């Protein structure tokens, strides 16, 4: 639901996936 309904959730899925070594980008949850 958080990965479906929120940018922050989505963006985290995507970067866990991409194997991205980059340090954490900063976001909160918005609708």
């Amino acid at each position: 639901r958080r990965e479906l309904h929120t940018l922050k959730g989505h963006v985290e899925a995507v970067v866990k996936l991409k194997g991205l070594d980059i340090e954490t980008i900063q976001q909160s949850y918005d609708i």
Partner: protein, 218 residues
């Protein structure tokens, strides 16, 4: 009725830009946009702008690891321009057809909120007069949504609640004043609690909670 129909196909297909087009057409054609219509339209823009915001965050982050930087920076540019275009697209439409005709509490808050969110997306990436004028437009759309919401909608209502959620992310992230963020968040959470006696609301109350524990921990 057709373009709505067409809207749901594009949605079934995950071809969201086309979903936008259809939904734009839908509104011009129209009088009072319906709950179904207003939601489709919003989902469509939600997804089209959403994909750009995601790619923008992932690239900015890459740009950060890197300090190439100017490739990345040209690229971000192009994504930045797509952003202005969509926010542009749906903002105009909000003045012209959408807001002016709002007949009810929810509807005005709904639209006034969208307006806030879209200036809010201009604000995450613009840098000049534009950032400033976007930060302001944002504050003032949210605020008038707030005045109506907090007075005509139940604290438990998905709209009152989503407004507060986005409103305080604006503070936290755009104005960069945490204090104002946590208080608005906390406040909106507590009076939903006062009245818990479902399911779009429930999610949103948890997102407020997660934002607070995250803003508290810096």
């Amino acid at each position: 009725e057709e373009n709505v129909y067409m809207a749901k196909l594009a949605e079934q297909a995950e071809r969201y830009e086309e979903m936008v087009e259809f939904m734009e057409k839908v509104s011009n054609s129209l009088e009072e946009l319906t709950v179904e219509e207003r939601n489709l339209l919003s989902v469509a823009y939600k997804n089209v702008i959403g994909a750009r915001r995601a790619s923008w965050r992932i690239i900015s982050s890459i740009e950060q690891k890197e300090e190439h930087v100017n490739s990345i920076r040209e690229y971000r540019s192009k994504i930045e321009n797509e952003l202005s275009k969509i926010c542009d697209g749906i903002l105009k439409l909000l003045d012209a057809k959408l807001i002016p005709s709002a007949a009810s509490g929810d509807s005005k808050v709904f639209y006034l909120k969208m307006k806030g969110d879209y200036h809010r997306y201009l604000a995450e990436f613009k840098t000049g007069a534009e950032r400033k004028e976007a930060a302001e437009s944002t504050l003032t759309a949210y605020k008038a949504a707030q005045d109506i919401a907090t007075t005509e909608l139940a604290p438990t209502h998905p709209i009152r609640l989503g407004l507060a959620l986005n409103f305080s992310v604006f503070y936290y992230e755009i104005l960069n004043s945490p204090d104002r963020a946590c208080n608005l968040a906390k406040q909106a959470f507590d009076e939903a609690i006062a009245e818990l006696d479902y399911k779009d609301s429930t999610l949103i109350m948890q997102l407020l909670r997660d934002n607070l524990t995250l803003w508290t921990s810096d």
